[PDB]
Structure formats: structure tokens, C-alpha cells
């Protein structure tokens, strides 16, 4: 038997665990095509048709960017782009109004409603109209069996849509 | 009825989604005092007895370890630090052994296993006696009523401890 | 040394493995009171104000209705009872409207928005009114500091309003 | 405007809340083969080999077996037997021992530590041999490469063993 004395400066008295950490993935894409039909008059849309390329997706990540093209999220190779279509704008007042339209992610589509909120409508610098607002509302995963093979545990089932548009007259 | 198109430069056609993640909180405590009876003829352990001041936690992050010294967690005002007390050391080999202590983390107290590996028997630069040891071994919340307040599922009930040791002889 | 042959009727080949699993609590409150001012010519709320004893809650399970009254939830002692208040009915047309008013949960108070669908206007078997109609709604323990020692994890942040409401008219 | 008063009878004041429960999955095989060398004079393991049918797994439900088979799994099709080999038994008393072995899971294989506990040795009935023993120890999925595509949040990494063995002498 014999003493020791511990050497601090190269001694550990060390532990790991294990916790869970909830975050939100915030993200847009970078290409998209739309068609906006919009009466000042009356504050009312009356056409909203929007394409999106899903290749130009962007959550601040490369390679969480790439995953999202492969079979287990999008399939980009087979179903290249997302797309909205409005179906009926229903007024609430000049400020707000319920948006209906077709949703269609990777070849499966649902309608669901977007909360429509008018952020301004103005005659710009040069005379011609602009107008600003706002689409959001909730959409589930499973609803448009989206991403199934991931669980609705590890990743909410619930998207959240935030549209922001600023938007000039035409010709 | 007005045709707009939209500015790029100020749409933003974005979601959010929330996600889990999981990952291993890394500790030690910087401030602890040991008491080391070990016989290299034998390659055994005879006494082997520690204090951890719980105060002197880290890990990496200055808010949680005060959130550690909590009610939820350490309770260090009236449970100011953790002790291990070595009860039996049962030998394998030179290298290896099964160390049985009573571990006590705010006054609730528990026979633990842990896993010795003896890392290196030496003498020193000036001719007296060195060693390098680890011990090893997990430990559950659970057992010792530790952290009540949190879920298993936040929070894992496996704490894996890891105690690396460099000592030096005595007097 | 000698052989053996497993007495396969008490040998066990046995593992445990723990996983997650995610469901839906639902739940009503047996006991409330309200005020229902509704408007049959043009399908419009005129006051809507529930109260409802947060004692009278039910989950199907016993012992979680009583642990829904402590302080880590409903503090039903000092907090008996949460009340709904409505400020504004937005017509939509008439089977769907959006209604705004103040929710009341332990004291602090948010203005929420409920999805109002009328599921049918009639005259009664007697000739006096009758009325069915739905709130629904989502609103976020968070905006309304509720169990905040419970983890967003563990438990949604993401509460889910589905008021089914038949009614008959007065005196 | 007209007032209403509420049906209690068929009126629900409701909510639906989502969350995470923890569980352990306890299984065994039903199915499997082993050969047990051990000699009592020394209580020391001298060869242990098992071979356990995959196809036999039992969870206590019918679906989750069948899944268990598939890809994602154990890919039973391809793999249809896990092995156990033992290299090594490092005695610690006649109760205890560390035995270390080669498991092999989907044609992946690691070098494992199991806990021998030896609950009971003697000579049986008819005056011929019988022993009981328990081997113990956790494995970790990522080790094993072992349905990577299931998180180890939504299932755990970590699996339990509990082999509970009795078992009498040959020929």
C-alpha cells in the first residue's frame, strides 16, 4: 500500500448527459413564380397562382439543403417544383381576409386556407400601383404525406407559412 | 382588378418548422479533494475516497451551471458537495478492476459500480511513485431522487460519469 | 469442465429498449356558465362570455385531473376559474365568421382569435329558437405563462380549442 | 339580436393537447440455439456460443415483430440470425464474472462486455449437472450500425440485455 495525492492540473472528474433541445427551422426559397390579381377598389385578390422551384430552398445550412431534395423529404428529381392556386378570397375587411387555394407538394394536394393581411396599398414614386402583405397560416406533414418515414416527434408535424410580398403594377 | 408581379428583393416565401435535437452535455468540477491508497505489488486499490464541491461545476456555460445549484437540481446552499466512498475493489487484472463505492448527491446515497482501468504504474522523474487511472461507470437520476422535476425524456436518467486521474506519491 | 444444454422452457433471451411515443390528451370542463347574444337574421354573435371551473376539468384519468389543479398547472385554489370574453364578431358569410376576445388562464389575460362555424339555425320543436355552432382555435401556453415548468417538449406549447356548442332561447 | 342558453347535454367545452410519453419495448426470442461449456470446480465460462433466430423476436405485439424483420430492422430476409461468441472470461468471484464476445447483428459484428452473475450451481434430481446464471450488459445500436434510420430520439441507442439462463449437463 502506498499514497497518492491527486495531481489537479492533469486530473478530470468529468460526466456527459444526454438532453433534447426543441428549435425552429426558419427557411424560404430563393425561386418562385407568381401571378397576382388584386383589386385596390375593393381590397380583394382575385387571382393567386405561385410556383416554386423546391431546388431553391435555403435553411442557412448546405447540407441540411441538399437532404431536403432526396426521397425522404421533397424528391426534387421527380416533383421539381411546389405550387399554390387560390381558389376563392374571402373579405374581411380592407385589412385582412381568409385566402382558399391548392396546395400541391410533391404530387399531393390539399386545400387549405392562408390568412390573408394587407400590410399598405399605394400609387409608387412613378404614379403606377404597389401593394404589401402578408400570407400565413399552418399545414400539416401528414396531410400531404409529406416526409412520413421521419417521425412526427423528431420533426413537427405542423409548417408554418410566412409569405411576405412586396409587389408593383404590371407593363 | 390590377395585375401586379412581385419584387424578389422584398418577398420572403418562407416557413417554420420546429425540430428536436439531441446532444451530450460535457462536465467537471473544478474544485474537489481525494484521498488515494493504491499498492503497485498488487495493482489494487485499498482507499479511495473523494468530496466534490458541487459549487465548482462546468459546463461550458456560465447560467446553467448556476441554474445547477438550484432546487431542481443541486440544492448546493444546503447540499454543498457530492462524496464518493470506496467500499470494496475487486480485482480482474493489472489493468482492470470493479471498484463498489457509495455514492451521495444531495444527501440521498447509493452503491455504485465503476469500471477501473489503470492506465500506468510509474516511478516518477525523483524516484517516487506515480499513477494514471480512469474510472468509469453510469449512474440514473432516478436512483438518487436527483432532478425530479425534469422528465426522463428532456433529460436523460443516464448520467455517464468519467473520473481521469493523475496522482503523484505523498510527503 | 462440462456441457450443457439450455432448458429453453426457463431461459429468457431478453432485451428492453426505450423509445418515445407522442398522443393527443383530450379533455372537457364539466362545469361553465355563458352568455350567448346571437343574432338569426344575419347570422351574427352579439356578446359570447363563458367562465369555466377549471376544477371541473376531465382527461378521462383520475389522478391527472387533480395533478391539472396544482401549482405547476391551474393553481385552482388561488386561480378557480378561466373566462372567455368576446370583443368583436367578424362575419365571414353565414355559416363562418372570426371571433375575437380575451382569455383569461390563471390570471393573465391574451386576446385570442376562435373560428366560429354555425352547423345550423333553427326554430324549435316548440317554436322557440335553437342554434349549433363550433369555436375552434389554437393558442400557445406560452402566451399565457401556463405550466411554464413543463418543457415545450414534454408537453405541446400548442393547446387546441374545439368548443361544440347546441343551444335553445330564453325565458 | 335573441339569447341563448347552452344545452350542457350536448355541448363539449374541449381541448386537445399533444405529448411524449417514454417507454421501454421488453422483447425476447423465442428461438435459439447455444452451447455452454463451464466447469464448476473453477465457476469460470469456458466456451458460450449462441445463435438466436431473428424470425422469433416477440415484443408482445403481433405488427411491431413483423416490422422488426423489415429493412429499417433487422432485414431478417438477408440476415436472418444474430450470433453470440464468446472470447474471454475474466473471473471475479464465484458469482461474478466480465465475459467479453463477439456479437454480430445483421452481419455487423463487435466485441461486447457481458455481466455473469452465476445464481446457482448444483447437482440436480437425478445426479446430473444444472446451473443458472444471468448475463447483463447494454450495446449501443450506432455501434451495430443498427436501424440508422430511426433517430436516437424517437428510439433510444442504447439496448439492455437480460439473458436469464438455467441449463442442465449433456447426454
Redesign the interface.
Given at each position: 500500500?502506498?499514497?497518492?495525492?491527486?495531481?489537479k492540473?492533469?486530473?478530470?472528474?468529468?460526466?456527459?448527459?444526454?438532453?433534447?433541445?426543441?428549435?425552429?427551422?426558419?427557411?424560404?426559397?430563393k425561386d418562385?413564380?407568381?401571378?397576382?390579381?388584386?383589386?385596390?377598389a375593393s381590397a380583394e385578390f382575385?387571382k393567386l397562382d405561385?410556383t416554386?422551384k423546391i431546388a431553391s430552398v435555403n435553411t442557412e445550412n448546405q447540407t441540411r439543403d441538399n437532404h431536403l431534395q432526396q426521397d425522404d423529404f421533397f424528391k426534387a428529381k421527380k416533383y421539381p417544383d411546389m405550387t399554390f392556386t387560390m381558389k376563392k378570397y374571402?373579405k374581411?375587411?380592407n385589412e385582412?381576409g381568409?385566402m382558399t387555394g391548392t396546395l400541391t407538394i410533391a404530387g399531393v394536394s390539399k386545400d387549405i386556407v392562408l390568412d390573408a393581411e394587407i400590410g399598405g396599398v399605394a400609387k409608387g414614386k412613378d404614379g403606377k400601383?404597389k401593394?404589401g402583405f402578408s400570407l400565413n397560416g399552418?399545414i400539416k406533414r401528414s396531410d400531404f404525406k409529406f416526409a412520413t418515414?421521419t417521425?412526427?416527434?423528431?420533426?413537427?408535424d405542423?409548417?408554418?407559412?410566412?409569405?411576405?410580398?412586396?409587389?408593383?403594377?404590371?407593363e
Open positions: 500500500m502506498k499514497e497518492y495525492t491527486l495531481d492540473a492533469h486530473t478530470d472528474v468529468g460526466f456527459k448527459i444526454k438532453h433534447l433541445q426543441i428549435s425552429n427551422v426558419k427557411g424560404c426559397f418562385y413564380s407568381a401571378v397576382i390579381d388584386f383589386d385596390p382575385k405561385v416554386i374571402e374581411i375587411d385582412k381568409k400601383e401593394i399552418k418515414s417521425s412526427t416527434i423528431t420533426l413537427s405542423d409548417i408554418n407559412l410566412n409569405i411576405e410580398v412586396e409587389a408593383n403594377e404590371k
